[PDB]
C-alpha cells in the first residue's frame with residue numbers, strides 16, 4: 001500500500017485562477033490485462049479510467 | 056454499657072470511661088460522619104464494590120463478544136452463514152462453530168462455578184464476622200479489626216455486606232518507668248493482669264496497657280503466684 | 296506474541312483481528328499478579344501491625360539475653376543492613392532451596408553473560424514464559440520477620456502481648472495445668488529445652504523433613520507446570536510439525552491459513568486452560584495465606600484459648616521465620 | 628532430557644558447538660500521567676549488551692540490580708512509603724525525568740528509649756489520649772444470578 | 778480509493794474487485810509548456826509513502842471527527858498509549874508484550 005498527499009499549485013493565468021497537478025497510475029504489468037487504473041484531473045475535476053487498455 | 060465493658064479488655068479502666076462518656080458519644084458521632092463522608096473520595100469500599108460490579112459486567116460483555124468472534128468461520132452472524140452458504144454443505148462447517156460456542160459456554164460456567172464457590176467462602180467468613188464480632192465478642196486478636204477492635208456494626212451493601220470496624224487508636228504517648236512482674240519479700244510473686252507496674256514516688260502502682268492511669272493495687276488486677284522468680288524487682292511493704 | 300507464536304510475520308499478522316481472544320488472558324494474568332502482590336502486601340502489613348522498635352538497637356551486638364539463643368533469629372548488622380539480608384536459620388533454609396527470588400534472578404542474569412546450558416530457565420524465559428520477581432524481595436520480608444522476632448523479646452514488646460519471652464512462656468505454660476512452683480525453680484531447664492529445640496529444628500532439614508518436602512514440592516510443581524506448558528508448544532496438535540518455520544516454509548502461504556488456524560486456536564485454548572488452573576491455584580494460595588496471617592496474628596503475636604490449632608498437642612509458643620515462597624512456623 | 632537440540636558437531640572441521648538461545652525477552656516501561664518520557668527497564672540484562680545489540684545511548688542511565696534501566700537516574704538511598712509504579716524487589720520509579728528509588732511499604736516505629744533494664748525497670752510508651760476511629764470493610768456475600776439459555 | 782480536499786483525514790470513495798495482485802505505480806510526466814517559467818510559478822511537489830499492516834487508536838469527537846491518533850509502533854510510548862485505549866494512560870508498570878527483537882531468517886534445512 002501507499003499514501004500520497006498533493007499540495008495545490010495555485011497557478012495564475014490571465015484573469016483566471018487554475019490548479020493542476022500530476023497524474024497517478026497503478027498497475028502490475030501494464031499490458032491489456034491486470035485491470036490498470038489511471039487517475040487524472042482536468043482543471044478541477046478528476047477523471048478515472050479503470051480500463052485495462054494498452055499504453 | 057457494651058462499649059464501656061468491651062473497652063476494658065484492652066487495658067483502660069472504667070474510672071476514665073465513666074467520667075468521659077460524652078467524649079465517647081461525640082467520638083462515635085464523628086466516626087459515623089467520617090464513614091458517611093468517606094465514600095466521596097477513593098475509598099476502599101467503593102473500590103471493591105465497583106470492582107465486583109464491573110467484573111460481572113466485563114464477564115458478561117466478554118461472553119457476549121464471544122458470539123461475535125469468527126472462530127475460524129467466514130462470519131459470526133447466523134443469517135449470513137445460513138443464507139450465503141448452501142443448507143447441505145454448511146452442516147460440517149457450522150459444527151465446529153457450534154461446538155466452539157458450547158465449549159466457550161462450558162468454560163464460562165466452570166469459571167462461574169469457581170467464582171461462586173469463592174463467593175460462598177467469603178459469605179462464610181462474612182457470617183462468621185456477623186455472629187462473632189457484631190452480635191457478640193470473643194478474645195481474638197486482629198480479626199474484627201486491624202488494631203484494638205471494640206465494636207463492629209453491620210449495614211447492607213450492594214451485593215454483599217458492609218461492616219463498621221470501630222477500632223481504638225491513641226494519639227499521644229508518655230515516657231514512664233515500667234516493671235513487668237514483682238514479688239513480696241515473703242517468697243510470693245505478683246503478676247500484672249493487663250498492664251505493667253510503675254513506680255511513683257516510692258510507691259508501686261499499676262497502669263493499663265493502653266492508658267497511663269496510676270491506680271492502687273487491688274485483687275482484680277493481680278495474678279497471684281506461689282513463689283517469686285529471680286528477675287523480679289524485690290520490694291517489701293506492698294502487702295495486699 | 297511470544298508463547299503464542301514466535302518472532303515471525305505470518306503469525307503476528309493473523310493475530311491482529313484474532314488478537315481479541317488473548318486480551319482476556321492478559322487481563323486475567325494481570326488480575327492474578329494483582330491478587331499475588333496484594334496478598335504479599337497484606338502479609339507484610341500484618342507482620343508489623345503494632346511493632347515498636349528502638350533506635351539504639353544493635354542487632355549484630357545485642358542478640359542474646361535470658362539464657363535463650365536468638366542468633367538464628369537475627370539477620371542485620373549496623374544501621375543499614377545491606378550486606379547482610381537474611382539470618383542464619385533463613386540461610387540454612389535457603390541453602391537447600393536454590394530456586395528462590397535471588398536464585399531466579401541469578402539464573403536469569405547468568406544467561407547471556409557466559410555459562411553452560413544446564414537449566415531450562417533460559418529456554419523458558421526466551422519463549423515468553425518468565426517469572427517476574429515479587430514486589431517485595433526476600434530480604435525485605437526476612438527483615439520484617441527479624442524485626443517482629445526481635446520486638447517480641449526486646450522492649451517494648453509487641454508480638455508477645457507486652458511481656459518478656461521468659462515471662463510469656465511461663466505464663467502460657469500455666470494454662471496447660473502445671474503451676475509456677477515448678478517453672479520458677481526450673482527456668483534453666485526451660486532455657487536449655489528451647490535451645491535444644493532450636494538445634495533439633497535447625498539440624499532437622501538435613502533429613503527428609505516435612506517442611507523441605509512441601510517446599511520442594513511447591514517449587515517442583517511450579518517448574519513442572521512451566522515445563523508442561525512449554526512442551527505444549529512442541530505438541531503436533533494434529534499438524535505435520537510443531538515448529539513455525541517448517542509450517543510457514545514447506546507449505547504455501549495461501550493454503551496454510553486454514554491449517555494453521557486449528558493449531559493457533561489449540562494453543563490459545565491450552566493457554567486459557569493453563570491460566571484458569573493458575574487462577575484456581577492462586578486462589579488456593581490466597582486462602583492458605585489467609586490461614587497463615589491468621590496464625591501469625593493468632594498464635595505468634597498473641598494467644599487465645601483454641602485447641603489443636605497452633606500445634607498438634609499442648610501448644611505453648613509459635614515463632615515465625617521466612618521460608619522460600621511461604622512462611623515457616625516453630626510450633627513449640 | 629526433554630528431547631530438544633542443545634548442540635551439534637560439524638563433520639567438515641571436527642568442531643563441536645553448544646547452542647545457547649539468544650535474547651528474545653521483553654522490556655518494562657513505566658509511565659506517569661504527569662510525565663512525558665518513559666522509564667525503560669530491561670529485566671535481567673547488562674548495559675553493554677543492550678548498547679552493543681540495540682542502539683547507542685541517548686538518555687541518562689545507570690546500572691541496577693534488576694537490569695539496565697534507561698531514562699531514570701538511580702538513587703538507592705532514597706526511600707518512599709507509597710509507590711504506584713512497582714518494579715520488583717523493593718524498587719520503584721516515579722516522576723519528580725523519573726528517578727530509580729527503593730520503596731518500603733511499612734517501617735517500624737523507632738523510639739529513643741533504652742533496650743536493657745536499668746535498676747530492674749524498663750521503658751514503654753503508653754498512651755494518654757485516645758480517639759475511637761472507624762474502619763471499613765466490604766465482604767462479597769451475594770453475586771448477580773446470571774442465566775444462559777440453550 | 779480515498780481523497781479529501783479539506784480537512785486532515787480522508788473519506789471513502791469506492792471499492793471494486795480486481796483479484797490481480799498490484800505490483801507497480803508510476804507518475805506520468807507532464808509535457809507542459811509552463812511549469813516553472815523561470816522560477817515564477819509553482820513547481821511539482823508530488824510525494825508518496827509506503828504502507829504496512831499496522832493498528833492505531835483513533836479518537837472520535839462528538840461530531841465523529843478524528844483529532845488524535847496513536848501510532849502503536851513508533852516507540853514504547855505509543856504502545857503504552859494504545860494499550861489501555863486512552864491518550865493519557867494511568868500510572869503503573871506496563872509490560873510491553875510484543876517488543877521488537879529484530880531476528881534473523883532461517884530456511885533450507887539440511888540433512
Ligand SMILES: *[C@@H]1O[C@H](CO)[C@@H](O)[C@H](O)[C@H]1NC(C)=O
Nearest residue numbers: 030031032033052053054055
Ligand atoms: C494488446 O492490445 C494492443 C492493442 O493496441 C495490441 O496491439 C496487442 O497486440 C495486444 N497484445 C497482445 C499480446 O496481443
Ligand SMILES: *[C@@H]1O[C@H](CO)[C@@H](O)[C@H](O)[C@H]1NC(C)=O
Nearest residue numbers: 285286360361362744746747
Ligand atoms: C535476668 O536473668 C539473667 C539470668 O538469670 C541474669 O544474668 C540477669 O542479671 C537478670 N537481670 C537482672 C536485671 O538482674
Ligand SMILES: *[C@@H]1O[C@H](CO)[C@@H](O)[C@H](O)[C@H]1NC(C)=O
Nearest residue numbers: 636637638639640641642643
Ligand atoms: C574427524 O574425526 C574422525 C573420527 O576419528 C577422523 O576419522 C577424521 O580424520 C577427523 N578429521 C576430519 C577432517 O574429518
Ligand SMILES: *[C@@H]1O[C@H](CO)[C@@H](O)[C@H](O)[C@H]1NC(C)=O
Nearest residue numbers: 659660661662711722723868
Ligand atoms: C499533575 O499536574 C497537575 C498540574 O496542576 C497537578 O494539579 C496534579 O496534582 C499533578 N499530579 C501528579 C500526580 O503529580
Ligand SMILES: *[C@@H]1O[C@H](CO)[C@@H](O)[C@H](O)[C@H]1NC(C)=O
Nearest residue numbers: 689690691692701702703704
Ligand atoms: C547507582 O547504583 C550503584 C550500585 O548499583 C551505586 O554505586 C551508585 O552510586 C548509584 N548511583 C547514584 C546513587 O547516583
Ligand SMILES: *[C@@H]1O[C@H](CO)[C@@H](O)[C@H](O)[C@H]1NC(C)=O
Nearest residue numbers: 075078226227755756757758
Ligand atoms: C484528647 O485529644 C482530643 C483531640 O481533639 C482533645 O480534644 C482532648 O481535649 C484531649 N484530652 C485532654 C484531656 O486534653
